[PDB]
Design a protein around this nucleic acid. Sequence first.
RNA 1: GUAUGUCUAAAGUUAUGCUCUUAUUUACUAACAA
Lengths: 150, 67, 211, 83
Amino acid sequence: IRNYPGHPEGTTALKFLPKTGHLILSGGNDHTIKIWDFYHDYECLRDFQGHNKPIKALRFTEDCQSFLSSSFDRSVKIWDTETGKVKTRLHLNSTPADVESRPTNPHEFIVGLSNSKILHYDDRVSENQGLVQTYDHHLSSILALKYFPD
Amino acid sequence: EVHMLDFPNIAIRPTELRLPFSAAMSIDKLSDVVMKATEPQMVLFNIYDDWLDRISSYTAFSRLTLL
Amino acid sequence: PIYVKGGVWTNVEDQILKAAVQKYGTHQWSKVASLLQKKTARQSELRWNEYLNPKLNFTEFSKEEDAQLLDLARELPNQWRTIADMMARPAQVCVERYNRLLELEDEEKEMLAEARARLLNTQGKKATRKIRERMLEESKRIAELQKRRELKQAGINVAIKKPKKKYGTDIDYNEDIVYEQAPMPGIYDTSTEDRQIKKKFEQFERKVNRK
Amino acid sequence: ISYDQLAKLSYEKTLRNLATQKVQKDTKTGKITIADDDKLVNKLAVSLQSESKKRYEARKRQMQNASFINDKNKQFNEKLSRE
RNA sequence: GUAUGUCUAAAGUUAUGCUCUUAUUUACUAACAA
């Protein structure tokens, strides 16, 4: 019905905020995550990334304060909503095609990889650079995950 | 018997009485810990703590056995 | 419960047996028996022979036929299989006629469902497995495409991996012509046609690219 | 009817479909360029496609007409029943 | 438990009538226990 030109490069990953969500988070194929609102006056606050490749899977925490982000250069990055200065994960084996955080506690944080090994990262465990435990019962690239909402 | 050949003083006791310890692992926190485990690790516990404090070990063990 | 076979021929059971016979024919009595949870192989075959087979007859005998029968009895004493054959009838029926002259559903539905399932499933495990692998393979292919396509959309061009060639002389047919057996040498000239077809081909390629 | 007759009879038919509505040789090369009307060849192409299309749809109708288990058996019993 | 068969093993090739809740059967399968 009504339009908005966001990301000139092809692919996009548009998602709202959770339940009480006035915001329109995007992060396209032009390696830049961007922020626009539901009020017709579309106001731009660009969360610039650092990592080279385009941004793939973007999702919020239950808190609506930090949103996760996945790229092709083995780089996941957490992102605080308005500020954007925040914990970072530069190093993986290769791209995690899809990522999601816990809908009850923003601390726990699942990342899912092409090699078919899935990874936890709590808040103190993101500080540790560790995992609570991995999953390895899928053998193909998983590219797909979401929590049972409890 | 074979892996106890390292040290001969440790006597073996084949129990005639079957004790329920398959269901021992279906205690909540135990199962939890089992699931949690990421690697070759041991995580010991005191299977009964307060009971020891109150009464002798045997008493505690009877309760445990029942459970 | 496991047990010794026997009992009585329920009409549904009979029908099932008939169906089996149509399917597997009159000399695989084991399989047909298996299809019936109650009744044996021997039982089944006997039933088919005696009652169920349509190339028997249970029409009444004419007076001439009666005469033939009773005459046979008089002459062949109680060799009723022979007598039956002579009559051209099944033997039990003949005997009965002679004698005359002288004077639950859940279970059934289970076997039915199973039966119909079987009869409509006519392939050895090799076949089933093969089709399974085919559909799985197809699924895999489409998933791969989705990745590749996704990356293209994303801006990373990934060429599709070849099939991991099984042997040294294994062929990819898109590399070059399969075994180009050329046309018979040209009596009538073909040059313009060659050009036109070439153009058509290239044009098609272009279209595909644009598509 | 033999394939002798059925050829000539089909030949006769497509002549009724016609009835509805230069040679230059380089003998050194052997190339016998018969320059002929490009409109007529196109009219052959369209007609021949249409003939094959008509036949193709004819089976499709006859396939969608209807003691068996699977697609093939039904037809196999039909191969027995025609006798 | 096997034959056997797939899989992975990292470097970027220069283009712009239904939903639901359950309890029961039967079948098959199961180097899982008895």
